[PDB]
Amino acid sequence: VTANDVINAVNDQNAQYATGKIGEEPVVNKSPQVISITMQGRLQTPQEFE
Amino acid sequence: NIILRVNEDKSFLRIKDVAKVEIGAEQYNSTGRLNTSAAVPIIINLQSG
């Protein structure tokens, strides 16, 4: 492995990206509820970064 | 007519085959109603001081 590989892995895996809502308009079949997608891609513990 | 991929022959895969394109609103989230009519409301915020 090279250092650049480590930098690429950290830059890629350790980030919080964007996820849209589920059931949002325009839908031909209306949904009773609209649900927003949540995610946690930023690791917080040293065991996760390892 | 945007070409996503060119097949092994001279046949072009295009957005029309895989998607439907139309001129729509940026967001369908909100709506403005006046009385029983449909009207876009213009909210004006006063500048400080």
Give yes or no for a contact between A17 and A37, defined as CB atoms under 8 angstroms apart.
Answer: no
Give yes or no for a contact between A37 and A12, defined as CB atoms under 8 angstroms apart.
Answer: no
Integer angstrom CA distances of residue B44 from B24, B26, B38, B47: 26, 21, 19, 9
Integer angstrom CA distances of residue B14 from B5, B10, B17, B21, B44: 7, 13, 6, 11, 44
In residues, how long is chain B?
Answer: 49
Give yes or no for a contact between A22 and A39, defined as CB atoms under 8 angstroms apart.
Answer: no
**Contact at CB, A26 and B28, closer than 8 angstroms:** yes
In 3D space, the residue among A9, A21, A8, A17 whose CA is nearest the CA of residue A40 turns out to be A17
Rounded to 5 degrees, φ, ψ at B10 are -85, 55
Give yes or no for a contact between A16 and A41, defined as CB atoms under 8 angstroms apart.
Answer: yes
Terminal Cα distance for chain A, rounded: 15
**Contact at CB, B29 and A26, closer than 8 angstroms:** no
Residue B19 has, within 13 A of its CA and on its CB side, a CA count of 9
Q: Which residues of chain B from 1 to 49 reach within 8 Å of chain A, CB to CB?
A: 24, 28-29
Comparing alpha-carbon positions, the chain B residue that sits nearest to A25 is B28
CA A23 to the chain's CA centroid: 19
Rounded to 5 degrees, φ, ψ at B2 are -65, 130
Q: What is the resolution of this structure in A?
A: 3.4
Give yes or no for a contact between A15 and A42, defined as CB atoms under 8 angstroms apart.
Answer: yes
Q: Which structural technique was applied?
A: cryo-EM
Contacts of B15 (CB under 8 A, 6+ apart): B1, B2, B4, B21
